[PDB]
Design a protein around this ligand. Structure first.
Ligand SMILES: OC[C@H]1O[C@H](OC[C@H]2O[C@H](O)[C@H](O)[C@@H](O)[C@@H]2O)[C@H](O)[C@@H](O)[C@H]1O
Ligand SMILES: OC[C@H]1O[C@H](OC[C@H]2O[C@H](O)[C@H](O)[C@@H](O)[C@@H]2O)[C@H](O)[C@@H](O)[C@H]1O
Ligand SMILES: OC[C@H]1O[C@H](OC[C@H]2O[C@H](O)[C@H](O)[C@@H](O)[C@@H]2O)[C@H](O)[C@@H](O)[C@H]1O
Lengths: 721, 721, 246, 228
């Protein structure tokens, strides 16, 4: 049984197979247990209260109670706890608060912060409401913890109210914290770089502080808002994992602190860097939603828990179980150099090979002949498009293709009519030159006039044109913060920018819910759960190399479902890596994600066209298995591995893709075992007609055979009889 | 369904959850699968046949079939396979054989080599009999594989027949081999040293050859006949483990060879060192029994599989589930300096504290006043014992105590009547001085006159005296091999010694089956599964230090059940380590094994006596849980750990012992989680009366609290309600 | 091939002797011929590196290090083959693409530079090459004539080792006033800072003129600061830095 | 200064920057030091002689001297040392030998086994000749250690003579052995495969035995006769 329970001084937050048990101890909240379900909790794992030197006390005479040594669910500075704080508020001459628990309530159903992406489908949830007060400062802090009945996840966020007669300023306000008992731990994170997104990093927890953070005003290519605290020795198949994640696309921090006693704190939230928040009397602040997810089935277990929760409670219901169209995108195919004739030629060829959707990328608006101008001028270039956009769209519809369009709303070029009319709309500092990035500037979405203008322009574009799909890019990070009327307002503008973004995108996604929106940021520059609340797929990476893609897809689907993960077959030599790969391998790698194409189909041989049509035919069959099915990593592509293998199960269908990076000689063939089959099941392998029991495939596995050569791949397809 | 099946060219050997599937390929036997059960095996994991350079072929025209590259179940040298061989026979001018499969049979029930310890309780087994022949050499090799219906174990051994007209000579004949597919593996072994027995070693499998072996004529203190080939990343709780073990107490070898292609061979058997075996026409040779055991539940899983199989099919039925008596042994207590008065005083005190059995150790026979003489003179020293042995025994019986006696049958002192009468009975080389060890020599048990004499002397001792328990020591290794009439007979004498031992001990254990026999070899010098077929417990180590014992008991119960593992509370400062430990800790450590006492109870304070009586009271209660119950390692004592914790479950009883080696300060208390409880079960902790659900104990665990100081311990006792 | 089916003795003991006697017979044979024809350069071989040991190298002053003539597969092979044995012994030939063992295309520049870390030869059908490939080979031959003493007679310093985890290989040779460094990268990388490659065993105060840019660097700079190693996009690229001490 | 020196019961084999110092202890040869040059060696790193359980003795009354525990330069089986042996000879009904040191000589210049490849340019070398005998078996074992003045290398090999009236059979005869003191070590070897020759392998030394070997009648693609 699940939901929230209040029993004497214990609070139980109970999701499926995951409990958070909190004790009220004279106004202080103690984390008693976070993990597998325990009813009638007694306190076997209670902290032993002793005098720890230099760990101080709320009263003079009791040296054994210290907030330096108690496990907690939020952190303050200045009351004796010296671990990193997660709430810190300036008021009067101090930034000491002392929030004490005063009252708990339980809500049922939908619940979340205003103006920030939060879980949906909440009919079967309950929320613990822990109301804390600092009576001297006259502030309220309210903590929310939400159960899910169908997932091992709890969601959290807080609300800070200013009930005093003066302005106060928030300096730190994380969305989730947990004090875990001394033990050996490892952490997994997703880091990497542009064209290397979501690189899986694993390391030992060491004394001191480890963090990942973004100060770029987007979550960034190089860090994802995720941190997995794992049992020492965790594998794909076994061990305890706790994943903490943030539904936020701005500046964030995740940290792990191992303190002097070997205790471990973890927390995630809005980055303290580039953040302060002014509250006038009666005003309040709500933090983004954090998630804590648990598995005892290792890294595959946490992948599955995380993917499920995202699919059911974050990704838009309209798309979360909807097969996504196989597209063509002209970007790598033509860059900015195209016109109506080329587009329709490309469309004709896409149609021949059975592609479903045609995406017109950058270069259709203003005078956007290169990447040095025109951002901000969302006006159709009718000369380039050889007529109205309406006219191009009908042309595309008549050819049997859905129609998609690229936007980059959050940006403005110096050389643009927009910048000529409103230079003050750029993020900038009075009396400092611009910092440039891809020769463009960032619109100040903290300015409500900017948001209203973008709502208006885009509403107009989407209502007046039959567009089936939007690709929403964002191609630089935020510099030169100085648009406030005061320092505090500038310190607010990065979070306000985010609120403006979320207002903009929630409005458009809602008022045009039939359109499939794909998020983008030079590929994977902002691929987080904040964006995925509104954009059910994401351009995972500008790196379209089949081999470079292996670690990228490993990371990109680690916590997020495969359905979200854009992947396109592109030309050779590849434009990022300078590499020749087999067209078969580019096909098979892209088919481990959400398939599209991004090369000039008009310039391909008859043979290459035929191959692509065969791939499109294959994926139409494989699409439900890949997009709707359960993913199992069999061999991980990392720094030391020469291989990648991923399996998908979906009812009676089981597919396995295998790739080898470098050619090898006088090396015994890999044995590749499948996962999660019926031992007694009978599995017929498509290529040889042979029937194998699930036991054989799982316990003996496949001898994987390849010719000589680099970047070869193969796929095994199984039907359960 | 389990047993043996022959289906076309496949042989299935099916134990509970473990299958060996063998293919006959034109007379060559191929290992197709060893692992979890597979029915209707098709060959997903078949070796891919290609031309491997320098891997040669039985025929001229087929370069793709090579015994260098096929996975096999026995190894020959000279047919193109260059991996280490496990059968090698000299005949005529060569030691090339080419054994080819000719015929298979299936046996039911009891089956094993003559004169060597083998499994019992075999009603529900079936044996695959694979009959091979070298027609040119006129030799037969017969392989046996036995299923068990109640254990994930298969047993093997072979028989070599000389069907030719000339003498032939066996050079290598292992008991089990397996070729495993290229993959990442680790190996676990039990090594260590005298007073450091069975140290658990874990390492990576690397190209080349790793081995453990004994050339000491006993298995030895420093290596156990065991080798666990593990899945990379195996833990206590998860991963595949294959344990290969040998039922043999002589010279053995276990090896792992990773060859040029990354393939891995493992094998166990009689050491080739110090071994050759002459076969006259019509003569045959049978190897000792090897075992292969499997788990997919990690190292605890393989501990359990191995312990179960030993308990049910190796250890004598008479004792395998019988609570063992709590004993006193006078060895550390008095050494050689004792007499009737001292013995009965010790007995009185043992009785007061509730000890059940009194063991008279070394020094009662011949003129054994020190360790420099008298071995071989098994004559009661009636002066020292103050009358007949019969008289001492009645005295001990009348005091309520069972009676036990120390023997060392396999040894002879230079200064002894035996040596004076028969100097040629010693293992020795004509014209070389003796090599001495503890100033004693080894009897040549390959001489049938030696065996007949020891049968006679000991039968006489056991029939004429009411002895309840024997402790059978063996205190040196074998040097100076030279008693043969030819070189070949000397090369035979180490295995013949073993056959003589097994003849001797099987005879006595059988003809006196009411007596509990404890094996010994300066503690753990010969603690293997050969000895444990006859001796249901073993003096695990001369190291009776409570702390030094931690890693020793870890190793000693790794594959063998706790019931076998002798452990005695001894005096402080400890005689081996020079260390003071709490009497509580010596008690609790010894109670993780088969409890006895070995200190001068007459010299203890009133307080220490009281404590011992309380420990004896406690263990009477804990004995079934420890000796009959299921063992779970919670914290392993190794080189880097400051801790040890072991749990035992037995029906409604759950106990956990925790020891800390070094005192620590400003270090958070350990959280200790229990295993294998009912989540919903209610567990009442004896010390505080508190009731905890199994979920809490398993998922939250116990905060472990201790004072300041070294070598402290505690025990938590739980009753399931 | 390797030796199977031991059974030529008149007794078991003589068969047990025949493998060592085989060796004694080999050594008698090869010492005789190498001695009676000492002007001839003998190269030992055994499907490449099947018998590359110090017994053979007493008589055969070079050895075909490997049948694998792939430029990239050669990296770990040359690492091992010159680990204890001098570079002069280590046969290495520029071969055709796609490579016959690995099935791989590599730049002719890389096949040249990898083979020039050993004892250079060629092993491809020169009659079937383009005019351009011929020209390149003539340039490589010209280069190696210059580099030969440095490589064969000079002192070798491993700077980056090609192993299972490394994406790189770099080897330096010093010979009097000459210092060369070869660098190879196996897989193309993106958004990865350039490697810093430091040289070894120079004079701190020495002045080293880099051939490609004419710049003069003190030995201290080359050893303690090192070279930013720059490459285009692509797999199996290589470069060589050549230094003259002034 | 380099070459060979005999000073009381110590033998010094001195190459450039590498010394092998051997002690004759009542016929038994002990490895005292192998490493950087030491003159006037005293024995700071001598084995401490104690009773090790199950390590046996040449005489009845001295439990502290054992060939199981002494560091040596050649290994026999059956005299109490249980480490892998490097000389093992069958004669009569046994393969127990007990070779004892009887005499040392020093050679200068060219020197090597007949019919096997050996060092050249040996003008500036000296060879320690350690003559051992098993008087019961009537066998001689002679160990040679050669200095080089221009290299930190010592070369070794042995000669076994049958001085008895019967056929004898050599079962093991390695060319070099060394007992090194307990410490943490790693080993490097060159292994690999055809088309992957001489793959550098590095690993930790662990309790038990590690080996590389060829049984192919050639040294082989997959292992080189080297161990670091
Ligand atoms: O401009 C359209 C383009 O926008 C995003 O990529 C931006 C990157 O494109 C090129 O790779 C360029 O070389 C890079 O420097 C630049 O960051 C988007 O992710 C692309 O899909 C495409 O739409
Ligand atoms: O002699 C009886 C004794 O025998 C075995 O132990 C032999 C060891 O005893 C002492 O520890 C001695 O110091 C050691 O050198 C010697 O090896 C047996 O294991 C002991 O229980 C005891 O019976
Ligand atoms: O036959 C001449 C050839 O001999 C040696 O190589 C033998 C190998 O040649 C091919 O690679 C063949 O495919 C292999 O199977 C065979 O082992 C020598 O090393 C070569 O240089 C060449 O002379």
């Amino acid at each position: 049984h699940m939901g929230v329970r209040i029993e004497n001084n214990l609070f139980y937050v109970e999701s499926k197979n995951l409990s958070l048990i909190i004790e009220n101890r004279n106004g202080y909240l103690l984390l008693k247990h976070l993990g597998k379900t325990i009813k009638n909790y007694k306190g076997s794992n209670s902290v032993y209260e002793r005098d720890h030197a230099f760990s101080g006390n709320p009263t003079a005479t009791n040296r054994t109670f210290s907030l330096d040594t108690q496990r907690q669910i939020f952190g303050q500075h200045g009351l004796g706890d010296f671990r990193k704080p997660t709430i810190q508020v300036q008021h009067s001459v101090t930034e000491v608060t002392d929030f004490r628990f005063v009252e708990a309530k339980i809500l049922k159903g939908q619940n979340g912060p205003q103006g920030l992406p939060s879980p949906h489908s909440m009919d079967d949830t309950e929320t613990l409401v822990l109301m804390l007060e600092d009576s001297k400062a006259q502030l309220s802090l309210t903590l929310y913890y939400t159960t899910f009945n169908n997932d091992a996840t709890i969601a959290s966020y807080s609300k800070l109210d200013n009930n005093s007669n003066q302005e106060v300023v928030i300096h730190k306000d994380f969305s989730f914290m947990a004090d875990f008992p001394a033990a050996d731990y490892e952490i997994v994170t997703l880091q990497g770089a542009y064209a290397r997104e979501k690189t899986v990093r694993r390391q030992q927890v060491e004394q001191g502080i480890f963090s990942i953070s973004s100060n770029r005003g987007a979550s960034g290519h190089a860090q994802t808002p995720a941190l997995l605290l794992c049992e020492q020795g965790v594998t794909e198949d076994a061990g305890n994992v706790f994943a903490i994640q943030l539904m936020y696309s701005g500046n964030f921090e995740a940290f792990v602190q191992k303190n002097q006693l070997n205790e471990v704190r973890v927390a995630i939230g809005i980055n303290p860097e580039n953040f302060s928040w002014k509250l006038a009397p009666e005003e309040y602040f709500e933090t983004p939603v954090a998630l804590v997810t648990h598995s005892d089935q290792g890294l595959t277990g946490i992948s599955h828990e995380s993917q499920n929760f995202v699919l059911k409670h974050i990704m838009l219901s309209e798309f979360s179980k909807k097969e996504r169209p196989i597209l063509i995108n002209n970007w790598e195919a033509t860059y900015f150099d195209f016109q109506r004739e080329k587009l329709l030629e490309l469309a004709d060829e896409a149609k021949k090979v059975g592609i479903e959707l045609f995406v017109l990328d950058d270069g259709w608006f203003g005078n956007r002949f290169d990447d040095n101008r025109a951002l901000g001028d969302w006006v159709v270039n009718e000369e380039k498009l050889g007529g109205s956009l309406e006219s191009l769209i009908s042309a595309i519809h008549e050819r049997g293709l859905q129609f998609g369009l690229w936007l980059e709303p959050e940006m403005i070029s110096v050389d643009s009519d927009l910048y000529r009319q409103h230079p003050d709309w750029a993020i900038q500092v009075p009396g400092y030159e611009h910092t440039y990035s891809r020769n463009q500037l960032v619109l100040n979405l903290a300015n409500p006039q900017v948001v209203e203008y973008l709502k208006s322009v885009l509403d107009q574009l989407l209502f007046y044109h039959d567009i089936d799909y939007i690709k929403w890019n964002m191609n630089r990070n935020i510099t030169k913060l100085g648009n406030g009327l005061t320092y505090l307002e500038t310190q607010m503008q990065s979070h306000q920018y985010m609120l403006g973004l979320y207002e903009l995108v929630s409005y458009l996604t809602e008022k045009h819910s039939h359109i499939l929106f794909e998020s983008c940021s030079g590929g994977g520059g902002r691929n987080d759960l904040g964006m995925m609340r509104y954009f059910p797929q994401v351009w995972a990476s500008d790196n379209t190399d089949a081999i470079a893609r292996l670690p990228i897809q490993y990371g990109s689907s680690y916590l997020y479902p495969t359905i979200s993960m854009g992947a396109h077959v592109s030309a050779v030599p590849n434009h990022q890596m300078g590499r020749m790969t087999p067209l078969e391998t580019r096909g098979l790698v892209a088919m481990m994600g959400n398939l599209g194409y991004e090369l000039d189909l008009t310039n391909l041989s008859d043979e290459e066209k035929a191959t692509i049509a065969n791939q499109v035919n294959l994926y139409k069959e494989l699409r439900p298995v890949v997009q709707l099915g359960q993913q199992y990593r069999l061999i991980n592509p990392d720094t030391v591995s020469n291989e990648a293998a991923v399996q998908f199960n979906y009812g009676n269908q089981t597919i396995v893709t295998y790739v080898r990076v470098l050619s090898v000689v006088e090396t015994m063939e890999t044995t590749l075992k499948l996962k999660d089959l019926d031992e007694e099941g009978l599995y017929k392998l498509q290529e040889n007609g042979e029937v194998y029991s699930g036991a054989e495939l799982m316990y003996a596995g496949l001898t994987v055979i390849l010719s000589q050569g680099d970047f070869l791949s193969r796929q095994y397809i199984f039907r359960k009889l």
